[PDB]
Design a protein around this ligand. Structure first.
Ligand SMILES: Nc1ncnc2c1nc(Cl)n2[C@@H]1O[C@H](CO)[C@@H](O)[C@H]1O
Length: 385
């Protein structure tokens, strides 16, 4: 029943996803708001603790007590130059508890501090409760994914997050391995297979090169930009619309925090529309000083605004190929991971770099990692019996 059931969790920097393999198919489980992915946000308020969508929706009104990016802190020391650099950009407080970072917040009127693994365990508890509500019984066995470059301390702290959440962690697997499992790239019989995973998320970009030799996976190279993602494209749309508002009304909205956030969420939505339409419309009632902002943007203008950012994704691909000591023609499969890989210009640039090659993209790229983890979780729980 429950002891023979296992879930696959994609614990992401910005979004998390949960899948289950049953009756020969993977089901990506929708949350109570109908969404197949849940924001990796935890809000601490005057009355409650919010997790996910409800936490992301109140981030504007409560920025000091809304924690996100815990995956950037997990398994790291306070003194780490990565932690020190990132701290300068977060609205929540990060403190030092014996060379270990803790996030300090106000909760139910009291000052409380949390380890990154306690924050990630609250996100994991939510994913577990989403699967339980879908299945009708508690599920405790789980496969949790991590980036391929995570060291032993980061993998251990992720496993500890799973323990705190009440999960029996069957295995911690690399995100590119879960993606290659989703496409069945480990069931191609004999002979070594070279796979490139192109992972463009909300706040991070990762390129991974894997060799699959008779079922066994081997990471040959990892490259990327930890500070490049979908949110940088939204910001380029934001800057354009602020300059367009200035040309039409002779008014600068940039300093008005409410006007910029409403513009930012509308730009995120418009960006997603531009993936399947050649134009998107913004309809913001009373954006600034009672002025409605009713405009449109073509896909051509959006591609111009983000041109330099899209082209920059090809340097880590070249870097990963040189590190792996492989030429383009030696790569058997190209796999797309992350919601931003849906952008037609991103697919066009990657396909042209690989000489007109076909891309593996039939599985929702924001769900491919949870899909593969759910498959691995089923295989692992069966062998356990
Ligand atoms: N259809 C889409 N076209 C463009 N960007 C998309 C799309 N879907 C998502 Cl999600 N994203 C972005 O992916 C990230 C999450 O994986 C977010 O930045 C989201 O906007």
């Amino acid at each position: 029943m429950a002891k023979a059931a296992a879930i696959g969790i994609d614990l992401g920097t910005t979004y998390s996803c949960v899948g289950v393999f049953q009756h020969g198919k993977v089901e990506i489980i929708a949350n109570d708001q109908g969404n197949r992915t849940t924001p990796s946000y935890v809000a601490f308020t005057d009355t409650e603790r919010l997790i996910g969508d409800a936490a992301k929706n109140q981030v504007a009104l409560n920025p000091q007590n809304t924690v996100f990016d815990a995956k950037r802190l997990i398994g790291r020391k306070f003194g780490d130059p990565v932690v020190q650099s990132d701290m300068k950009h977060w609205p929540f407080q990060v403190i030092n508890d014996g060379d270990k970072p803790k996030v300090q917040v106000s909760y139910k009127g009291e000052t409380k501090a949390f380890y990154p693994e306690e924050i990630s365990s609250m996100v994991l508890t939510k994913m577990k409760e989403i699967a339980e509500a879908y299945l009708g019984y508690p599920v405790t066995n789980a496969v949790i994914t991590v980036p391929a470059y995570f060291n032993d301390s980061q993998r251990q702290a992720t496993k500890d997050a799973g323990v705190i959440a009440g999960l029996n962690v069957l295995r911690i697997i690399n995100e590119p391995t879960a993606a290659a499992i989703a496409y069945g790239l480990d069931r191609t019989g004999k002979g070594e297979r070279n796979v490139l995973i192109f992972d463009l998320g909300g706040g991070t970009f990762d390129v991974s090169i894997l060799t699959i030799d008779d079922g066994i996976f081997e990471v040959k190279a990892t490259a990327g930009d930890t500070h490049l993602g979908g949110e940088d494209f939204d910001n380029r749309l934001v800057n354009h619309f602020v300059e367009e508002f200035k040309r039409k009304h002779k008014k600068d909205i940039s300093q008005n925090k409410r006007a910029v956030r409403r513009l930012r969420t509308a730009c995120e939505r418009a960006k997603r529309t531009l993936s399947s339409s050649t134009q998107a419309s913004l309809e913001i009632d009373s954006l600034f000083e009672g002025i409605d902002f009713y405009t449109s943007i073509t896909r051509a203008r959006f591609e111009e605004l983000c041109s330099d950012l899209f082209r920059s994704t090809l340097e880590p691909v070249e870097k990963a190929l040189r590190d792996a000591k492989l030429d383009k023609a030696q790569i058997h499969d190209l796999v797309l991971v992350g919601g931003s890989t849906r952008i037609p210009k991103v697919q066009k640039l990657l396909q042209d770099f690989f000489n007109g090659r076909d891309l593996n993209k039939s599985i929702n790229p924001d769900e491919a990692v949870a899909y593969g983890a759910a498959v691995q979780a089923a295989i692992l729980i069966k062998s356990t019996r």
